[PDB]
Amino acid sequence: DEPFSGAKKLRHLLENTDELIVCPGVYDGLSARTAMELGFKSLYMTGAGTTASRLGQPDLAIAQLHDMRDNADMIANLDPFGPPLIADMDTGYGGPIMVARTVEHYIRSGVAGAHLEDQILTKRCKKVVSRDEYLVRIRAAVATKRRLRSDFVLIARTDALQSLGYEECIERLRAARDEGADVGLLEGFRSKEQAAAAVAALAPWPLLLNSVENGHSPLITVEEAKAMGFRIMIFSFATLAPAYAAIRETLVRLRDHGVVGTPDGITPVRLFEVCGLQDAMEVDNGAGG
Amino acid sequence: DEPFSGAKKLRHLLENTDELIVCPGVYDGLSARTAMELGFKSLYMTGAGTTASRLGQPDLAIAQLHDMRDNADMIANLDPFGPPLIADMDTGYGGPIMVARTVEHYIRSGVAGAHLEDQILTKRCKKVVSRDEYLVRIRAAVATKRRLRSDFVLIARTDALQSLGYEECIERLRAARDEGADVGLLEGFRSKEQAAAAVAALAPWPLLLNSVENGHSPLITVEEAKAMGFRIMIFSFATLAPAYAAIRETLVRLRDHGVVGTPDGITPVRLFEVCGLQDAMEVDNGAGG
Amino acid sequence: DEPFSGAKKLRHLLENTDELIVCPGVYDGLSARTAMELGFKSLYMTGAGTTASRLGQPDLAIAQLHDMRDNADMIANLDPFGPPLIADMDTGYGGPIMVARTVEHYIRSGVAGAHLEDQILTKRCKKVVSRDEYLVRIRAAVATKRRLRSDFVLIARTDALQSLGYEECIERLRAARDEGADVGLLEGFRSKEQAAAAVAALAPWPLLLNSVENGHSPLITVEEAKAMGFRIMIFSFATLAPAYAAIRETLVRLRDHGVVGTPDGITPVRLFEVCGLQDAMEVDNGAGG
Amino acid sequence: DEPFSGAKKLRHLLENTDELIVCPGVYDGLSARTAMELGFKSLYMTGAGTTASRLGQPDLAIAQLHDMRDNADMIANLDPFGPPLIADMDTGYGGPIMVARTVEHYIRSGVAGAHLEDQILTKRCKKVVSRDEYLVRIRAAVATKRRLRSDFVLIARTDALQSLGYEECIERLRAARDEGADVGLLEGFRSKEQAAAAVAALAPWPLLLNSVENGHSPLITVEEAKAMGFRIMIFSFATLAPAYAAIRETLVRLRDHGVVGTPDGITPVRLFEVCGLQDAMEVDNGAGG
Ligand SMILES: O=C([O-])C(=O)[O-]
Ligand SMILES: O=C([O-])C(=O)[O-]
Ligand SMILES: O=C([O-])C(=O)[O-]
Ligand SMILES: O=C([O-])C(=O)[O-]
Ligand SMILES: [Ca+2]
Ligand SMILES: [Ca+2]
Ligand SMILES: [Ca+2]
Ligand SMILES: [Ca+2]
Ligand SMILES: [Mn+2]
Ligand SMILES: [Mn+2]
Ligand SMILES: [Mn+2]
Ligand SMILES: [Mn+2]
């Protein structure tokens, strides 16, 4: 109904429906505009993608609050009445003060939700901090969203599986739940059985499945994830990866054959249309221009 | 030889060789990193692409100095010893004071060159200002690059063909040349004959051909452009367009079939490798980490 | 009551009270934090000050949307429950598309209101555009705040007095009023009589008096302005000017006598306290840190 | 001689003279422009000041690379031929990858030098990391400035005195020296005797004295510091503190008496003059405007 109400919209989807919320991972204006064009009900802003696109760098804690907030603020608000945005917030970019600032900035920027992880600050796409230090992050985040009277959906992410194992992950999610996290994310399942098991272990508290295209986790389909009981599923590299493959293929053709060769329906005007040309023309015409 | 010497490198290519300098149009870190991966000798930063990707908006004078400089600064310097970057600088983002500031900022940011046009400030991918007002822009730009003792390659772009015709375009380029522009860009040729004619009219002053993929200008190949006498050729939508087509195709598959389906060789690690993973690991390992 | 409700708060002050709303002109975090420390009920973000502080440049259309929005976003939200912020929005930074984007960004950023002027885009602290072109700006701005269902207070500023005279100013304000502006600002009165006259001419539509410290307009006190019927009074250079005088005096002492000599009660900790140390410590302590 | 050669200029002052290099601490465009107006030969950009002014926050690791680089880039380049800028770089904003990125960005931005400290990432205006972890930072920084063939002056700062004592500080500086730091900074001396002692302990390797106005370190005059053997002296709060006192005094007067009362010589035009009005007018006039 109201503009900039992504958090309320996501919260409604989570609490008022049983649907699996499918969130394509977007990383810039073009990828986000394309997801919106196609009618996705929620979007996900990847940190890895944001770093690659906005900074041309690997996902090694190089993007910080300013870059992440700027990208999320841009994407969340392309349409003030558009789909909610879940955004990576990494480790919160510092201690509790920075976690709170991050949540506050995301909330202000119309971001619907974000995932906060237990990696050491010098993180990567892997060591984690203590359970207690993780919970300091979660507490700082929850207190902020409450202080701000926001419906912001905080997703507690654990990267502990690799180094600490399943039980530890489940216990961290349970602890995070108690501190006020709204959704859990056990990063990098090793098997589909294990994914269903984590859902069962934490039910009825909602989980989010992070599908990493061409990564090191099992390929789980949307229908498989829904049947498993997941409530959100994000697709981290859903746009960055095909963008790279296409850009590379095209530039190789340009290099070797002196032509770009992009299907002719992809015109500048169509691109502008995807990126809000109509809205802009309406503004201009409406203003008496 | 030296880091951040893109301007010198481009200048050398222009003055010390007869090669057609082929510049794929890039718009973010991923597109730029891909062009670099493939060994292009010079890159072009599109304004339309920058606006679509960094802002999710159409090319309607929405991106301003800060966005354009930030993107160019990022791209030009991904490799301090990398290929020169020619960047769109639109109309200079204001009067002479802003044109000068823009050139100064681009120069400081390691940008090798930029094209400056005669469109009215409220520009678009079309009305132009008077010849005199255009020359005020060119003069402000040239004086700046000279004041800064820079090899910065200033490209004088004219969008006058549409509304004023060929002769007017040629005269504006001649005037711009005299004010100190290094290269001319007659935007949007209507025919290959006309493109060769503009080159002949301004010889031996170098021209740059702007190829717009799927646009409204004749399809000219690299070999055709070289034979015509052009010295630079940029490919405005060379990466933005195929990126869109691929992202869209992928998201449609995700929407309809619940899987992303990106060829499996495009892994997160490969993407990180393209985006400077090795450099980063070298830094960390080298620092005793 | 609610966080980020500056627009509602300003609107309430305007519509629900007869008080003269006194807004000290602030330009950075320190000046804003000081105004807040002292209990001002509303703040004003100067464009000239923003340009001097964030960019080190004169008020010559050098700061653009990104700089202005970033500064306003920072200041408005230092306290989510703090005083409303009226921010300079100059000419809207472009055509109607940019005016709308500017208003949209200010609204999103919690800004309570802004003044929009009729200067030519290449403005200064003086030529104005036609009445019709001005109204295109106003219309774009009003349509945006309505589209966004916002209480944003749009102040229509006219700089026409200098070149066009009083009657023209009054007519522009009347026109702006009809297009939906909430408050009028006749910039640079020449006399106190003329200021009272403009109020009378537009009553009961509220006016805002812009007091420029050490400028070329009559010195009007708060009590004088209230008696004249003004509803808002901003103090453009209220913090930038004394900051400069003090910084200069201090640096001269440092240069000549080798000591800074700042009264000893102005400690780093006091400065941190003014700039939100307590809030930060509360966050950290509260998070279990 | 050449534009953007702050690093070379600072390096020359350090290596080719025996003068104490006096650097007033500046934090925005106005403070920097004032220091330049008065002829200081080098400027210092305070992190605390940058955080207070650009962010309105306390010096608690809230400003990150983007804010710090943006401020330093702005200040260093107000005059391409102006005085060198030494800028706070805190802990490097992350692990070795971020330290290197920070140094690279500062170098690109014309920054002459920077101090890098051994505080834990969650720093403050106090715990320090291990000697080895500190040296990882220093190594990353030195390798970067070398890779970039830059004269950048790296200042190794130690905050270890408080928790670890004098000997530890001296040993860290010696280690940092060996890893390639150009200057040492023992933060927060407890006595003048101890300051002279640190200089003697590290001679002939240059030290920098950080004078914190109204802080918890002894008041040392410029002449005292020179006699002690220091080669650089920075004045952290030299402009932020008097700015606050003046802004506060003024706003209190405005609040209580309805007038600003700033000495009348501090006009908008004078402020614009201090902030580069002449340069701007020269650009405009020169461009044929
Ligand atoms: O950055 C990402 O794409 C993530 O964390 O899933
Ligand atoms: O923006 C662009 O891509 C251009 O101007 O060629
Ligand atoms: O910029 C300002 O301070 C104004 O417009 O009053
Ligand atoms: O931030 C500062 O001012 C410092 O570290 O001296
Ligand atoms: Ca094609
Ligand atoms: Ca695949
Ligand atoms: Ca003192
Ligand atoms: Ca005065
Ligand atoms: Mn991530
Ligand atoms: Mn363009
Ligand atoms: Mn203004
Ligand atoms: Mn500091």
Side-chain angles (χ1 to χ4, degrees), chain A residues 6-23 40-43 82-86 112 153 206 231-232:
Chain A
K8 293 187 165 188
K9 292 180 184 182
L10 179 55
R11 168 83 49 188
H12 178 278
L13 284 175
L14 196 64
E15 294 181 342
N16 298 340
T17 84
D18 297 299
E19 294 184 55
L20 175 64
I21 305 159
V22 171
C23 306
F40 286 86
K41 293 187 68 172
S42 183
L43 274 57
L85 177 70
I86 292 171
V153 174
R231 291 304 318 292
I232 309 175

Side-chain angles (χ1 to χ4, degrees), chain D residues 44-49 59 68 88 90 115 117 125 157 185 187 210-212 234-237:
Chain D
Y44 168 63
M45 187 189 89
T46 163
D59 190 24
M68 292 298 286
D88 191 353
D90 293 285
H115 60 79
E117 67 203 43
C125 165
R157 163 174 160 168
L185 165 48
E187 178 57 43
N210 173 33
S211 176
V212 182
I234 72 184
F235 293 80
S236 278
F237 286 77

Side-chain angles (χ1 to χ4, degrees), chain A residues 49-70:
Chain A
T50 297
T51 308
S53 177
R54 285 185 68 88
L55 302 181
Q57 300 291 333
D59 190 24
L60 299 176
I62 290 171
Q64 302 195 297
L65 181 52
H66 185 283
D67 314 282
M68 292 298 286
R69 194 226 166 170
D70 271 20

Side-chain angles (χ1 to χ4, degrees), chain A residues 28-29 33-34 37-38 52-53 56-58 213-214 222 238 242 244 248 250-251 255 258 262-264 266 270 274-275, chain B residues 28-29 33-34 37-38 52-53 56-58 213-214 222 238 242 244 248 250-251 255 258 262-264 266 270 274-275:
Chain A
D28 74 338
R33 283 288 197 178
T34 307
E37 182 198 346
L38 297 172
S53 177
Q57 300 291 333
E213 176 67 2
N214 300 334
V222 164
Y244 170 76
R248 191 190 201 284
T250 298
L251 289 187
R255 189 188 60 195
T262 303
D264 286 14
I266 316 304
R270 178 164 172 200
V274 164
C275 294
Chain B
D28 74 338
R33 283 288 197 178
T34 307
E37 182 198 346
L38 297 172
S53 177
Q57 300 291 333
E213 176 67 2
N214 300 334
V222 164
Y244 170 76
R248 191 190 201 284
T250 298
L251 289 187
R255 189 188 60 195
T262 303
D264 286 14
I266 316 304
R270 178 164 172 200
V274 164
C275 294

